[PDB]
Structure formats: C-alpha cells, structure tokens
C-alpha cells in the first residue's frame, strides 16, 4: 500500500524513519519505492546519494523533463525517487512551482496500479501546500511522527492529523520526568497511538552522517529493531 | 534593537529560546516586547496565556479588529503579542490569510520609532511567506537556531540564512561522539557561530509544561544561565 | 553572612554587600596564620559603556569558595582568594563566560597586602547610596501587580493592554 509519513512538527525524525522503514520493509522481502515529497530534498542523503546530484521528480518537472527518469535503485527491492535540488531563487519563491507539480499525483497512481511495488513510502512535509494535500490524499495510510514533549502535546490538540493516521513516537529518552508524565497521559488519552515507539539512539544520529538507513548502518541497534517491529506491524495492519 | 529568532529547521528550540531571552532581557532591566510571528501561536504558552485565549495580532487583523488591543503585559518591562489562534480551515489554506497581514509591517516600524522598548524580539517561522520576509527585513539582527546534528549540518550548506545572522546552538548533549565531531568541525569551518551554546536541559523541557520562561521556572538551571549569557552578549553586540 | 565575614571570611562566596565585602577582605588581610602576600588578588573592573555594572554582575560566576565580588560606584570589585597575580587572567576566564575585555573597558589590580588594604580604605569612603545590589534581588523586590498563587508557587497572569500608537 501507499504509506505517508508526516511530522506533526519539523525535526521529529520523519525522514530518518522513512528511510529506515523502507530499508526494513525491503529486508523483509518486499518491493519498496520511497519518494521524497519534502522540498528540502534530504531523504536522498540517507541512501548514499551524492549531495551534488541534483536530479529529482520535482526538478525534472520544473525543467520539462521526464520525472520517471529520476529514480534510483538502492537494492533489488528498494527504489527511491528524490525531490531534487531547488535553487535559492526557487526556495524563496514557492508560489511559482508549488502548483506546477500536480503531474506526480496522477503518476503515483500509475505506480500504485502497476503492482510493481508492495509499498510506496512518501516523506511528507507539514506545510499546507496543495501538492502536499494531494499526495496525502493518494496515501492509503499515514503515520504522524511525534516526540514526547510539550510542543507536540499542544499540537495534538490544536492542529489536524491526517485522517486515519496513527501516531508514532520517536526520540523517546531515558530519565525525563516530564516525558514520563506526558507519555502516561498519552497512553490513557491518545487513541491513535501505535503500540511501539522508537527510543533516542546514537545509531539514529550517526546513520545520516554515514548516509545509510539505520538498519543498514547498525542492524543490531535498538532503534533498528524497533523500526523493524514497525515494518512487521505495517505488514499486519496496513496491507490494503 | 529588533532581534529575529528563526530556526534553520523545525523543533530546534526557537520559541523556548525566544521566551527565555525575553525574560532575561527584562530581568537585566530592559523594556522588551516579544512578538509571535509563527502561525502555530505557541510562544504565548510560555507566558501562562490560557490556551482558549484566541486573541492575537493576526487573529485581530483577519477579523477586522485592532491588533494593538491584542497585547499582553507579563511584567513591568516585558510585553507579549501573540499570533492568535487560527481555525483548522485557515491552517490548511494559508493562501486565504497570508496576504491579509500587511498592517504588522508598519505597526512594528511604529513600535520601533516610539522608543517604548529597548528590545523587540520576534519568533519567526521558517516558511517562505512574503510576510515572513517583510518581518525579517524589519529586524536589525537575527539568530539562526540549530541543533548539532547531521540535518542542520546539511542545511547550513544548502539553504540560506538571514543576512548577517549568527548561529546559536541548542540542545547540546553529553556523550554523543557524532555531535562532538560535527561540533569540532563547526568550530573550524562555521564563521557565524556564537561563542556560547545551550545544553539540553530538563528545565527547558519542563518550563513549557509549567507555562513559564526557563529563567522564571528555574533560574539556577544551566540553560537559564546560558540564555542569560546570551542576553548579555546581545546587550554588548546587538545594541540599538 | 556578616558573621561569616567576621570569623570565616574564606568560607564566603558570590556577591557580598559592599561593606561586608570590605570587612571580609580586611579580615583576610589581618589574619596572622595566612601567608604574607599570597592571600589573593583584588580586581576592580569598569564595564564598557554598553553595559551597566548590575548587568555585568550577572556574568560574574565564581566557583572557588573564597572568591567574592561586589558592585558599587559603577565598579565590579572581585577578590580572588589565593590567586597569584600571574594567574589572574586564568581565574578571570573561569569566572566569566565571555572575554573580560569585551565586558569591561578598564581594570585595576592589587595583590600585595599594603596595596589591598589601602584600596579597601578608599572603597569604604564610598557612600552607601552608591552600593549596588544584584539585579535578580532588586527585580524581585519590585511589586507584582498580576501575581497569583496556585497553592505552591507564584504565577504571573498576563494582563490585556493596548500597544499605543503615534
């Protein structure tokens, strides 16, 4: 199925989890396609893509080229489609290009209908652009990424989550009383909370500096095993 | 002077630091106005403003009211101007209201010229809004907020920072090898990096849960003393 | 605190009131069981024009027991216990989180007993009106027109106001 991963807030671990989950699903014998819908184009760097490599689906569309030629094969069962590098001019003027990318909405359904991939993972930003809402509409399921802090606790009450989304906890620390309090309150009040979480883990901080998914970088790391649990949970619950 | 604080990424501590810095400046004997320019309207919650209090400068402009009546006095030398609570529809459709916030540019220039405040701090979003660019142009100085991780390291090489901004480190942790490596590299390569940093402190995680700035919540916490050093540095270098 | 400066001056640390500071250093000077000229260094610091002494006082964070400071007459005065004059800049760098040259425009030092005692004489000529107090102490002694107690701690209540226009 098509799985969207969107952070309730910036910098909660969405991109690292998306790459790690794609690697976990590929390791489980599934054909995976992972696409970067965030204009910062950071997902590619978790798969040893050269920083100077500017190609991507949104870059090819802004240049009139074929976005289907922007894909990259990581393993025999894991392909990725980067966003592409935007210039500083395009960065500071998103009015021009955020409406010229609706082709990917129709094109993803082609990949959805071909059956070549058992999983299509989408790294989604939390902006409210029309292309973000369209890609989220293509998703069959969603994961809202949070950390256990007061910021995310507020957001869970004042902003909207994707319909039917499940809440995934990341960066769970040891020895934080305020975290323990917020967590217990969530266990008793947050209905959509997943039955597994991801701890703070030096492997999760190091894998991006090694430009690899955490499962490839350190398969015996605790966060790698927790994300592998999430992968199996997706097989059991998100297959439809 | 007018000081803007903007994270190079979400969730790096920009709001908490903005509230802590406004508390330190007013405690140093300076008249301070702190302004929430982020649509998420979170800054107010660090000053014991009730969550159901929907008032704010942008909320007042969208409703046809006078934004000047949306101010809030916290101490004799610290005034607060929240953004205001947007509805879910307004959150999902920023183009409906982003263009209707023109008054705040001249309004802040008026507060600059009035000479009532020695410091006007602004919690700035990382979006590419035209209103966000206009508020950044009104700023005399700016602080770019980062965490010491691979994400921010990439961003410092691929995205633009405000002109003349200084880089402020937050959430500095103990016992992270990759953090030490990125930090040692920054010390020799990053030229806009501030001499002081802010460690990860439980007091900074709890103060928002207590709805207070960290300096008021726990004046003897390490992060409170680091923010206080930053406030004195602002007196010495950003004086205006 | 006053009895401490009388009998055990070396056990004091941190900010001391101007008169208590002078009495503590004088009691150290006249202690016969202490070394003849290794008792410490007296440092007077004039802040740069962009910062007031009470503000610069917030940056003075000694850690060694016996290091004490005071403010008065737009001067921050430190006594670094048993610090040798050669190691002055080392001790100062430990106490302030920023370079002292950026905080203070001028600095004077006395490290010999006779010099320290003569400087204490001049310091005591200063009228009490010029004696400073720490900013957190004075800012806390101000009234609070919007306080509210929750049963354990005082909380501030933000009051609606109008940002005036002209």
């Amino acid at each position: 199925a098509v799985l969207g991963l969107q952070g309730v807030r910036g910098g909660v671990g969405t991109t690292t989890i998306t790459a790690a989950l794609a690697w976990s699903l590929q390791m489980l014998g599934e054909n995976v396609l992972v696409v970067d819908a965030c204009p910062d184009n950071l997902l590619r760097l978790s798969f040893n893509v050269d920083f100077t490599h500017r190609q991507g689906w949104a870059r090819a569309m802004l240049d009139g080229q074929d976005w289907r030629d922007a894909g990259l094969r990581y393993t025999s069962q894991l392909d990725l489609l980067p966003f592409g590098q935007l210039s500083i001019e395009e960065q500071e003027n998103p009015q021009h290009w955020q409406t010229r990318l609706s082709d990917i909405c129709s094109g993803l359904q082609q990949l959805k209908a071909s059956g070549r991939y058992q999983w299509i993972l989408i790294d989604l930003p939390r902006d409210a652009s029309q292309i973000t809402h369209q890609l989220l509409s293509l998703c069959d399921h969603s994961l809202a990424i949070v950390n256990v802090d007061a910021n995310c606790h507020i957001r869970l009450h004042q902003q909207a989550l994707p319909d039917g989304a499940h809440i995934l906890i990341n960066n769970f620390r040891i020895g934080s009383q305020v975290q323990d309090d917020i967590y217990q309150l969530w266990l008793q009040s947050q209905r959509r909370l997943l039955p597994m979480l991801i701890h703070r883990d030096e492997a999760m901080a190091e894998c991006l500096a090694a430009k690899q998914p955490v499962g490839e970088y350190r398969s015996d790391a605790l966060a790698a095993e927790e994300i592998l649990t999430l992968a199996n949970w997706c097989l059991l619950n998100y297959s439809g | 002077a007018v000081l803007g604080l903007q994270g190079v990424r979400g969730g790096v501590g920009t709001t908490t630091i903005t509230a802590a810095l406004a508390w330190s400046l007013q405690m140093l004997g300076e008249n301070v106005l702190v302004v929430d320019a982020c649509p998420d309207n979170l800054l107010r919650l660090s000053f014991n403003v009730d969550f159901t209090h929907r008032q704010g400068w942008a909320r007042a402009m969208l409703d046809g009211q006078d934004w000047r009546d949306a101010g809030l006095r916290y101490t004799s030398q610290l005034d607060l101007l929240p953004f205001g609570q947007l509805s879910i529809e307004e959150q999902e459709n920023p183009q409906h209201w982003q263009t209707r916030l023109s008054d705040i540019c001249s309004g802040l220039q008026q507060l600059k010229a009035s000479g009532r405040y020695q410091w006007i701090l602004i919690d700035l979003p990382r979006d590419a809004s035209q209103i966000t660019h206009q508020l950044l142009s009104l700023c005399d100085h700016s602080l770019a907020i980062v965490n010491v991780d691979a994400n921010c390291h990439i961003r410092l090489h691929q995205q633009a920072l405000p002109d003349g901004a200084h880089i402020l480190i937050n959430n500095f942790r103990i016992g992270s090898q990759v953090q030490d490596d990125i930090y040692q590299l920054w010390l020799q390569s990053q030229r806009r990096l501030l001499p002081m940093l802010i460690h990860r402190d439980e007091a900074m995680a709890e103060c928002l849960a207590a709805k207070q700035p960290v300096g008021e919540y726990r004046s003897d916490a390490l992060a409170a003393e680091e923010i206080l050093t930053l406030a004195n540095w602002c007196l010495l270098n950003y004086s205006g | 605190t006053t009895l401490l400066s009388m009998t055990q001056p070396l056990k004091l640390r941190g900010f001391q009131k101007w008169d208590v500071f002078c009495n503590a250093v004088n009691n150290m000077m006249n202690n016969p069981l202490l070394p003849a000229h290794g008792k410490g260094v007296l440092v007077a610091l004039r802040p740069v024009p962009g910062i007031r002494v009470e503000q610069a006082l917030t940056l003075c964070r000694p850690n060694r027991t016996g290091d004490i400071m005071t403010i008065g007459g737009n001067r921050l005065v430190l006594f670094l216990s048993f610090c040798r004059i050669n190691d002055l800049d080392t001790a100062l760098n430990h106490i302030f989180p920023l370079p002292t040259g950026d905080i203070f425009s001028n600095r004077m030092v006395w490290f010999e007993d006779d010099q320290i005692s003569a400087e204490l004489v001049q310091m005591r000529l200063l009228a009490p009106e010029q004696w400073g107090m720490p900013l957190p102490l004075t800012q806390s002694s101000k009234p609070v027109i919007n306080a509210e107690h929750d049963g354990r701690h005082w909380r501030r209540i933000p009051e609606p106001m109008r940002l005036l226009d002209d």
Binding site: H157, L185, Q188, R191 | - | -
Partner: peptide, 29 residues
C-alpha cells in the same frame, strides 16, 4: 481523537496534572 475520561484512576496522572498546568488545561477542556 483524544479522550480525557477517568484520568484520575491512575495515581501518577493525578499528580502529573497538578504539577504541570499545561497538561491540566487540556484535560479539563
């Protein structure tokens, strides 16, 4: 979807809601 019914049954939640006014004001809403 957030449900704040019968929070007080757990001992820790009652103390947590009392210590952190941010958590209390969302539960009492």
């Amino acid at each position: 979807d957030i449900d704040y019914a019968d929070i007080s049954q757990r001992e820790q939640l009652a103390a947590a809601l009392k210590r952190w006014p941010l958590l209390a004001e969302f539960a009492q809403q």
